[PDB]
Write a new protein. Sequence first.
Length: 217
Amino acid sequence: TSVQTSSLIQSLFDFRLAALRIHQDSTAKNASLINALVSRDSSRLDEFFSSVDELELSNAPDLRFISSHDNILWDDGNASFYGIAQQELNKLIRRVAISGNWHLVQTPSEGKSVHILMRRSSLIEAGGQVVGYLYVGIVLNDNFALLENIRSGSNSENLVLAVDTTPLVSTLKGNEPYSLDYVVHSAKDADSFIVGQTFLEVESVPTYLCVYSIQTN
């Protein structure tokens, strides 16, 4: 049923965000991180995160960077691969004002605007305090792994993650009877290929992220 797959899709989505939050908040309390940081040895923080992912590459964020006010002490350097300019990253610092909550934000890239789910976690020190903030983000554009993981987890035929009429990522192979174009401009829960619509909530808050789910009669 509509609301039932929609419900499942949302939980699968929540599941991925929960995994990142948990690891984020846990790493935010790792002395190693805190001291590697305080040393302001920008370049030392590098092996550290490499170690964190070394053991969990699967659940790693697409981008990480540490802030201290409008300053950026460190950046894993992935923002660049996404065409995100170091300066836009600074603007995100402000955007994601509070901690403990995921933020759906969009940034200009070397092309279309990139949609990102970001979250901030305070970096406190051994019994002193805030030495900075760790920001982690998930880039939605072309994030095939994220969408496919939801498709399989929900045993859906195909999924399309979009913003309005513009697709961010799709699981369609291309050999389907229906095209991406049809799926995005389709009318919800109506045919040979029933297309459900699910607007994802982030932190129980409504968003414009729409997941189109396709199922054949």
